[PDB]
Design a protein around this nucleic acid. Structure first.
Ligand SMILES: [Zn+2]
Ligand SMILES: [Zn+2]
Ligand SMILES: [Zn+2]
Ligand SMILES: [Zn+2]
Lengths: 104, 96, 69, 93, 82, 69, 93, 105, 78, 96
DNA sequence: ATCGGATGTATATATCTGACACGTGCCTGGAGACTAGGGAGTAATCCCCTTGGCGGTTAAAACGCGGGGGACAGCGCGTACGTGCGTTTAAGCGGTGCTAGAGCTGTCTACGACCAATTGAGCGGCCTCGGCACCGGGATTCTCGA
DNA sequence: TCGAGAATCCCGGTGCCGAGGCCGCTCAATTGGTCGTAGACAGCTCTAGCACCGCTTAAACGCACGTACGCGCTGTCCCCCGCGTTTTAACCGCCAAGGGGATTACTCCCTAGTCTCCAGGCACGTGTCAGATATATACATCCGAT
């Protein structure tokens, strides 16, 4: 009795996504191939930024990810910054920059 | 004695505060302000502990971004000192 | 009761028409907002004059309104 | 009572791109909210997109169009390519 | 009752936020403007939070109400369970 | 006595605004001709209640007319 | 085929506040498209607000508290009073 | 027979609103007093905007409303402008104003 | 192409805006701004009209695309 | 002959164009622009007559609103002439 | 441009504590197998609306010239802001009590979905006439060179 | 200052097409029953929000001094606005051809709903090492006398 995720070859849960879609008041019916497609996109999107966060964390001689690394990873990518446009991250800080005219 | 020229200490403070991630306002006064503000919408409410923390965390990025825009407004007029005109112009253009 | 008599007289100056001094103020012009009685204004108009008695502003027939109280 | 979350799946994915790094407790609750927000956005777009054409079911095509409408630039070009292949494999078995 | 609590946002607290924003010199009249702006901003969020709380027949404002009120005006906040 | 007092009260009611009972009557309505005070008029306009309190036909902001005395 | 619209009701309302006045076709279309937008904006908030409290039925209370969330200033209180009066008149059948 | 709108003393259709609410994927079931509540709010807003539009039309020596009158009525009221802050009206125009600095000295 | 947006038309738009004096380098920048704005909406309109197996861009796709970008438009249906 | 001092004529077009409501861009060259922009996304397309009108009506309002905002930036720097460095500041503050 | 004194900053070494990572039982939600009916794919058609081309007017666009007003740089001065020190205030931390209110459980009843039969409200077509666009007339206000 | 040139002005005609009203015909809303689940209410548990006290000691506060910067003034020059002349192509009316949008049958297969069975993930407990704190030391950096 294999699960649907193993059949598709993913790591996110197909069945829970299907249930969430069904009991969410989106439409009268839900297709058979919709949860698989939706899960395969969420998995890629979350795996995209974890790698950047780990890269940002390795440069501070750290081995754990705290919100600052997530903020640094998100705000340093042009395509990723548009997605999280009007979003604030708790305990994130800001990106270091100074106007050129203020320097001596 | 020793004395730094006007401008270097502020420049160092800019670098120091742009690297850390903490809360710049105190905690007791902010909570006492929130309670007084909310007391005129409904009497004797109660506040969950994390509600005030979320409010304070959300209310600081707003000020930081507004100051960031005010800096550009001030520089546009060949100045290095921010004035209330810049804040008013920034809020006018943003649509507030 | 001199104060009460003075108050009543001052109020009478306000309510009663200034020029006719015998009819209540129930007449107005939009040009300046000065209020008079209804009886006076038609004779003033029939005098073929368009000068405000107070602020000399020009007025016409269409600049005539009734007021109540 | 209990409460579901995406913690175990996020950890399992993380152990595939950085086999040594861990994750803090406060940083987990940020990813767990990010995934929920993205899911809600995509589903909400697909629902009205299906409603516009007087349909009554949500198929793969509706959310494939919603992904193209939401994600900006090259990201979309990759996400679509990641989705369809999954579907076809699921059909083969 | 509580009164005169806006003065708890002192000069150094405002100046630290200004430094984090990246400014060098500050005029002497900025503080009143900043206090007014913050007082205006707080009320809009708190009113919606109290409305959400009142609808559910509760008496304590929870973090979920604050998150929902913030999201209602395009200011979504991550990291508090929302 | 009371007769002069009654006349003074009659003038007292007519001179001041009938709504707020504190200010001079200086605002008039072109539609109905009634006169009230400006202070009541702005707060009635800001309450989205554009209708005369007495004669009850509607009016707009531009129908307000300033008058003197 | 048939096409539903609010034109007749809008004209009927207009003949109540201005007995002798007309309206052009473009203004009629604009007023038609305004009601369809306000209705959807109000109805969409009540669904979310009923979903938050783990309920399945939207009733007069959800509309009551959505009006206060969307409409600003004196508009909200006037609308609330007007709705409440109609509801309390309808039930006295 | 007797329509629900007449029973509630309204001018907007209660039944059509009920059907639109039911067939719009908003919830599993809707109440019996929600359409009555919503149809009153919609009518109130419509009458409120339509009165100001008519006043603006009358001030221009016309007797039929055109989109310019709607724009003039909307943009001169603070709350109505705030409600429609991100809406563009076709063939509306703008509000006549000029900055004081540009005026001749 | 883009050269059809002549200088007098830009001057008329600026006059309706309320400006009194115009520099000489404004036109070449207004054209670039307008092209980007048009490109942002045409893509969404074409996506909407392609999802429905159609071949002509109707007036509903344009208003839907404008609405999804934060700027609605009254007077063209819906 | 007769002449007008620089400025008085420009103050009359402002009053004239703020009272009218018609479009200010010629229709044919605008249509030929959209029909060419839409050529890269998908070839052999057709346009309904009202779609082009809607697109033009949407573009005019955006351009006019941006031109209204850049004037405040021009005034802020004690100027009367608008320059390309004002449009950039307005768009930056807006969030583009 | 030169160096030297003084100050703030980055680097390598103990230690030590609480949060992260792993193991266990147990449900409750997900997988397998089966049936029935309506939503959607496919073929045919037919007529509306889109594209393409021609000829005439004339309104708008392009080009050149002259001059005056506004943009920009350089100077001078005086007040407001940054830096540092000594003194005053209240934030932060810990520990202890008390109780209001959030959360869960068990019953039961009124209310909203679903179905069948009727009939009047609202929509599509069709006239028609009057509100609005265009034309001159005689009443009070622009403007710029003396 | 005040006169000349360009722009008001109220008011009796003329013509046209689109807004307003009327009619025939469906089909969506109204009445009347029936039933089963959602939610309203009473009861009980226990947790976390509010209040008080005492002690560091970090940060807010007030004062004085000097200087860099904001602001007003003057001068130059160059570039943008007004106006007249010539070249362009937008706009309008008319015709003709055909692509594809919208509607109507027909059928089949895909998804909801039901029941049974059981493995995954959630709450709970436990160990140990990654990062925070403290400290000595080397080094970059700023300002002043030359
Ligand atoms: Zn008199
Ligand atoms: Zn006078
Ligand atoms: Zn009064
Ligand atoms: Zn009256």
């Amino acid at each position: 009795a294999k699960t649907r995720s193993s059949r598709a070859g993913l790591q996110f849960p197909v069945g829970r996504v299907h249930r969430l879609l069904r009991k969410g008041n989106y439409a009268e019916r839900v297709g058979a191939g919709a949860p698989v497609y939706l899960a395969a996109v969420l998995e890629y999107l979350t795996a995209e930024i974890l790698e950047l966060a780990g890269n940002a964390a390795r440069d501070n001689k750290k081995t754990r990810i705290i919100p600052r690394h997530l903020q640094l990873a998100v705000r340093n990518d042009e395509e990723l910054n548009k997605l999280l446009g009007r979003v604030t991250i708790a305990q994130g800080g800001v990106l270091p920059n100074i106007q050129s005219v203020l320097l001596p | 004695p020793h004395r730094y020229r006007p401008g270097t200490v502020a420049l160092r403070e800019i670098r120091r505060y742009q690297k850390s991630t903490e809360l710049l306002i105190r905690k007791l006064p902010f909570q006492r302000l929130v309670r007084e503000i909310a007391q005129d919408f409904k009497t004797d409410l109660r506040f969950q502990s994390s509600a005030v923390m979320a409010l304070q965390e959300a209310s600081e990025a707003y000020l930081v971004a507004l100051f960031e825009d005010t800096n550009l407004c001030a520089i546009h007029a060949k100045r290095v000192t921010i004035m209330p005109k810049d804040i008013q112009l920034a809020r006018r253009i943003r649509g507030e | 009761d001199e104060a009460l008599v003075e108050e009543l007289a001052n109020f009478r100056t306000l309510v009663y028409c200034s020029l006719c001094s015998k009819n209540w103020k129930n007449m107005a012009i939009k040009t300046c907002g000065h209020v008079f009685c209804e009886n006076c204004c038609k004779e003033r108009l029939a005098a073929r004059m368009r000068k405000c008695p107070t602020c000399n502003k020009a007025f016409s027939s269409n600049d005539l309104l009734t007021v109540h109280l | 009572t209990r409460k579901e979350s995406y913690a175990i799946y996020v950890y399992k994915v993380l152990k595939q791109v950085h086999p040594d790094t861990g994750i803090s407790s406060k940083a987990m609750s940020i990813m767990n909210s990010f995934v929920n927000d993205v899911f809600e956005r995509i589903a909400g777009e697909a629902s009205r997109l299906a409603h516009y054409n007087k349909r009554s079911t949500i198929t793969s095509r509706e959310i494939q169009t919603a992904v193209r409408l939401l994600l900006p630039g090259e990201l979309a070009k990759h996400a679509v390519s990641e989705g369809t292949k999954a579907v076809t494999k699921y059909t083969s078995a | 009752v509580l009164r005169d609590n806006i003065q708890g946002i002192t000069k150094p607290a405002i100046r630290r936020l200004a430094r984090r924003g990246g400014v060098k010199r500050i005029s002497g009249l900025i503080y009143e403007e900043t206090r007014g702006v913050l007082k205006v901003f707080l009320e809009n969020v708190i009113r919606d939070a109290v409305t959400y709380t009142e609808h559910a027949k509760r008496k304590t404002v929870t973090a979920m109400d604050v998150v929902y009120a913030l999201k209602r005006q395009g200011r979504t906040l991550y990291g508090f369970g929302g």
